Amino acid sequence: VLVPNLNPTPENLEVVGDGFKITSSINLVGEEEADENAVNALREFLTANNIEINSENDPNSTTLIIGEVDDDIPELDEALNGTTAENLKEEGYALVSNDGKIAIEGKDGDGTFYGVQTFKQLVKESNIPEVNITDYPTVSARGIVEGFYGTPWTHQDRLDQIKFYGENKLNTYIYAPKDDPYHREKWREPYPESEMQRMQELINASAENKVDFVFGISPGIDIRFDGDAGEEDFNHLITKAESLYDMGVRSFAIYWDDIQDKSAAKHAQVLNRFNEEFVKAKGDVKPLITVPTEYDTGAMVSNGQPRAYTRIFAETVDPSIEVMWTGPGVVTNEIPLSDAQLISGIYNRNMAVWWNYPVTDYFKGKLALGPMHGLDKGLNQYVDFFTVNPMEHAELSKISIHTAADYSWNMDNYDYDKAWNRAIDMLYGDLAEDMKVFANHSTRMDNKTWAKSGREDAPELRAKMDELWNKLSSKEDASALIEELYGEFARMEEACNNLKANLPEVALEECSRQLDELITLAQGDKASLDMIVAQLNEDTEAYESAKEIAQNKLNTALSSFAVISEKVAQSFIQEALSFDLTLI
Ligand SMILES: C[As](C)(=O)[O-]
Ligand SMILES: C[As](C)(=O)[O-]
Ligand SMILES: C[As](C)(=O)[O-]
Ligand SMILES: [Ca+2]
Ligand SMILES: [Ca+2]
Ligand code: NA
């Protein structure tokens, strides 16, 4: 039995046997000791898969042994056969499946939860490969920052995301929706009881899935620093955090991104005192997180030094506080190692990243369905906290989010093309190949001004198109390539028609306009080829009809709100329109 697709990619995986079939009922050893959340996740799986737990041990049944390094379970030590989570970093685990026994040992509880996650990905129709795995993340915090503008996620969207994060070993969710005044416009005041159950449902869902629910506060709207409105407003900040602490919040983020009010020393004072009086006082609270007013390299540095704010902020903030930045720009092609080194150097600490992809709020007509791209594979040298800013489109965000889980857990081995393919395969099953056709055309984000990021759209198709123009302007035979391109354009329309018919409403409601748009472009792309063949056949009537169709298909794509494949399927039409074979 083969190893299924896994996400994230485990650090170490060795195929050690032929694989075995899990029995209809199993022996469960260790559930009394092992991490509750981890056991609950196992039980949920076993139920959904029709695998019963024996009330009494039967040596003919499959044995599943679960626990932590701390625990003393001899059945665990036996089944692991020398493999252990003892030497592993936090969230690490060991997984051994060999000859009727599956053994999960976490370095800690989060770790046993993640082991279960790998187990659930390993098992297909009762069959499991025989493997030994030791696994642990590259980066210590890995998650989503809910920082996009436009229509907020629904409550159900959120619950589903949290469960999705847990399944793919993402441990951070920074909560900050624009339709929640208690994070900004009413930052001072605690949640009323009418909003309590909703917030409780998020806190509990997060805790169950080993996701740190980070509560992001943006006081900058109207926060006062100076004098006694300032001792007032700082105490309001404590009051709020205390009312959230009582609900179960153990992680906090304070934003200075939108304030116009701009004093590094004042922002950092609030942060430091909050840190001493709250986060250190509670003992229970994770390191404080902040977003400075200058949060991209262009805004932070000028002329080979930091700008005023950044120098003062870096000098004043406690070393234990987590500082976010977006890379070399707000939305940018890359975070090269050199940029992380620079910023990390200025702050004399490991940085946190806020990565603005797949967010599309700055160019909402296009969907960002690409992988993590442009992020240095050695980034962990200067960064120990990684978040992505997703789209308002929760369901379709899962594709790039899937790749972020792999990038941040197994950075050194991250392969953007393979990770992209794995995301669509795992998310879309039988609809995967059709989803690839469409999503391949919608990875590159570019608002034509300040914001651009992402793998280029449909690169292989781009290259074939370029080859066509090259052959045709070189008096070379392009017969076979013309045939091949007709096939690609027909395949584009076919895949989109399939997705329209078979995608669930939850995806379809996010992408239906972009599906129609790629159909229109595929049809304009076909017409474009018809122009070429017409010229080759010296059929002016066929040329003129195809030209009129191609121009129409281009014009509708340009007018529509939806945007896709600008540099490829769209641009090909304009290229064909302007091309004239008779001059070669
Ligand atoms: C600052 As933004 C990338 O959420 O528009
Ligand atoms: C084609 As590339 C190395 O910019 O992903
Ligand atoms: C570029 As033409 C042949 O439509 O004038
Ligand atoms: Ca335990
Ligand atoms: Ca358009
Ligand atoms: Na033409």
Side-chain angles (χ1 to χ4, degrees):
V1 324
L2 275 18
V3 184
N5 285 314
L6 302 172
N7 191 59
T9 314
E11 267 293 329
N12 304 291
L13 189 153
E14 200 212 343
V15 169
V16 88
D18 279 319
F20 66 90
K21 193 171 177 66
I22 299 171
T23 49
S24 297
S25 221
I26 63 151
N27 300 139
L28 227 191
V29 179
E31 349 92 72
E32 43 164 62
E33 298 303 276
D35 179 86
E36 181 190 16
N37 299 323
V39 169
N40 288 153
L42 179 54
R43 294 185 189 276
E44 182 187 34
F45 183 74
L46 298 183
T47 300
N49 289 262
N50 191 26
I51 301 168
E52 285 278 312
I53 299 156
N54 289 336
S55 50
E56 60 216 310
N57 181 275
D58 180 347
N60 287 326
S61 297
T62 315
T63 311
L64 194 322
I65 315 93
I66 194 171
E68 283 82 60
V69 170
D70 261 57
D71 295 330
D72 313 88
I73 306 161
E75 296 105 325
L76 224 197
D77 310 348
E78 190 280 333
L80 287 168
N81 207 258
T83 291
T84 184
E86 135 75 53
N87 54 334
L88 302 185
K89 58 154 68 189
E90 290 158 69
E91 313 186 285
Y93 68 89
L95 189 150
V96 171
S97 63
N98 187 276
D99 189 59
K101 293 173 184 161
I102 303 137
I104 305 171
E105 173 182 72
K107 176 56 183 291
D108 47 48
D110 292 334
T112 310
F113 179 89
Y114 295 151
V116 172
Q117 297 317 312
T118 313
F119 169 76
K120 291 163 44 173
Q121 294 188 342
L122 256 9
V123 174
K124 304 294 186 180
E125 306 171 304
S126 279
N127 293 311
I128 188 171
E130 279 176 305
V131 301
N132 48 209
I133 297 170
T134 53
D135 198 21
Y136 53 90
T138 302
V139 179
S140 152
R142 308 169 309 278
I144 273 69
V145 56
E146 206 184 4
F148 48 88
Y149 292 86
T151 109
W153 287 351
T154 67
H155 186 54
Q156 293 305 322
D157 283 348
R158 248 160 228 149
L159 267 7
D160 177 78
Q161 287 288 306
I162 290 159
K163 189 157 177 67
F164 182 65
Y165 308 156
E167 277 163 3
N168 292 275
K169 305 198 175 77
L170 296 164
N171 69 11
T172 308
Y173 166 47
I174 307 178
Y175 176 77
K178 310 286 192 209
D179 67 348
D180 193 352
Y182 303 101
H183 111 278
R184 194 180 166 262
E185 30 290 302
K186 292 179 178 181
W187 74 267
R188 267 172 286 255
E189 46 218 63
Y191 281 93
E193 252 88 8
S194 72
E195 218 62 74
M196 224 69 165
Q197 189 214 314
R198 187 186 66 70
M199 287 296 292
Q200 207 51 244
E201 279 182 359
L202 294 175
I203 295 160
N204 296 347
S206 289
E208 295 169 11
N209 284 286
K210 311 299 200 185
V211 171
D212 303 332
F213 180 88
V214 189
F215 188 91
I217 328 150
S218 317
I221 177 177
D222 56 19
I223 188 178
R224 305 161 295 167
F225 301 97
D226 280 334
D228 66 25
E231 185 75 13
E232 199 190 333
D233 275 356
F234 176 81
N235 282 164
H236 278 313
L237 193 66
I238 290 168
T239 296
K240 182 55 158 283
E242 272 182 312
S243 74
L244 292 163
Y245 186 89
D246 299 332
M247 299 167 76
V249 182
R250 293 298 175 271
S251 281
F252 302 84
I254 294 160
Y255 290 42
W256 300 120
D257 65 331
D258 59 6
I259 183 180
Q260 310 265 306
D261 279 359
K262 147 106 181 169
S263 189
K266 287 183 206 181
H267 301 167
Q269 151 64 358
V270 172
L271 292 178
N272 289 337
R273 194 182 161 183
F274 187 95
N275 197 44
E276 274 294 321
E277 284 173 36
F278 193 72
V279 0
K280 286 166 96 162
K282 290 298 191 187
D284 212 0
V285 171
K286 306 268 290 151
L288 187 62
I289 299 138
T290 196
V291 188
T293 315
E294 303 172 344
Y295 55 80
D296 79 272
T297 308
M300 297 156 92
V301 317
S302 179
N303 301 334
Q305 316 279 140
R307 301 168 109 118
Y309 179 101
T310 291
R311 191 220 312 114
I312 301 172
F313 195 96
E315 182 195 338
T316 321
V317 276
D318 196 88
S320 67
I321 298 164
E322 202 84 56
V323 186
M324 309 202 92
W325 105 119
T326 59
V330 177
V331 181
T332 189
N333 293 327
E334 290 175 64
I335 300 175
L337 194 63
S338 70
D339 184 69
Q341 184 192 358
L342 180 71
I343 302 299
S344 178
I346 287 160
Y347 273 91
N348 191 29
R349 67 187 76 195
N350 291 329
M351 293 302 291
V353 359
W354 171 313
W355 184 244
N356 286 311
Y357 188 104
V359 62
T360 58
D361 52 19
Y362 58 88
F363 199 63
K364 316 190 192 175
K366 190 157 190 189
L367 300 169
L369 311 174
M372 295 296 94
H373 178 91
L375 296 164
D376 202 278
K377 274 164 78 167
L379 225 47
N380 71 129
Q381 176 170 2
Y382 303 109
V383 174
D384 206 22
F385 194 114
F386 185 79
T387 60
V388 296
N389 189 18
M391 304 184 273
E392 59 171 278
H393 307 297
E395 186 60 23
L396 268 45
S397 288
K398 293 182 183 177
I399 296 161
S400 52
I401 290 173
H402 190 284
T403 69
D406 191 68
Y407 172 73
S408 60
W409 182 279
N410 198 334
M411 192 174 289
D412 182 41
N413 290 283
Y414 179 71
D415 182 312
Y416 74 79
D417 186 54
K418 275 151 139 74
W420 182 73
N421 277 275
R422 255 194 324 271
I424 298 167
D425 285 333
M426 293 179 81
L427 284 162
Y428 287 91
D430 275 325
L431 217 37
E433 288 312 301
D434 284 335
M435 188 64 185
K436 287 174 204 200
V437 173
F438 170 63
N440 193 40
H441 272 94
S442 194
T443 65
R444 179 66 182 176
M445 294 294 303
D446 190 351
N447 77 346
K448 315 181 227 280
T449 55
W450 66 273
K452 65 200 214 303
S453 199
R455 190 211 73 187
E456 301 295 316
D457 294 326
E460 301 88 22
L461 184 54
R462 214 342 130 183
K464 295 188 191 281
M465 289 172 167
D466 290 346
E467 178 181 314
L468 178 76
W469 299 134
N470 188 25
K471 292 191 175 171
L472 289 180
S473 56
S474 296
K475 319 194 192 205
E476 305 182 351
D477 171 69
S479 265
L481 182 57
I482 288 162
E483 286 166 333
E484 174 161 24
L485 292 170
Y486 274 122
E488 300 264 321
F489 304 146
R491 175 85 194 103
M492 278 158 64
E493 181 169 7
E494 185 200 48
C496 293
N497 279 323
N498 252 98
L499 292 170
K500 280 171 51 153
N502 300 296
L503 243 26
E505 175 193 19
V506 73
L508 211 46
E509 76 187 350
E510 301 188 348
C511 69
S512 79
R513 292 171 292 190
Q514 289 84 11
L515 290 165
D516 273 1
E517 172 96 345
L518 196 62
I519 284 162
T520 291
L521 291 176
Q523 291 176 353
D525 287 345
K526 181 265 182 190
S528 297
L529 292 177
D530 286 0
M531 281 193 283
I532 299 165
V533 175
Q535 289 202 292
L536 283 152
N537 284 334
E538 306 182 300
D539 188 333
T540 67
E541 175 187 20
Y543 176 76
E544 293 292 338
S545 162
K547 186 182 153 171
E548 190 277 334
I549 299 169
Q551 185 66 75
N552 280 342
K553 299 292 172 176
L554 180 60
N555 286 350
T556 119
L558 293 182
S559 295
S560 47
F561 166 79
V563 182
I564 202 171
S565 197
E566 304 99 292
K567 302 288 203 203
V568 185
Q570 180 185 289
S571 174
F572 185 68
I573 306 173
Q574 192 52 263
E575 295 160 22
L577 277 166
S578 298
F579 186 80
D580 186 356
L581 218 210
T582 66
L583 313 175
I584 314 299

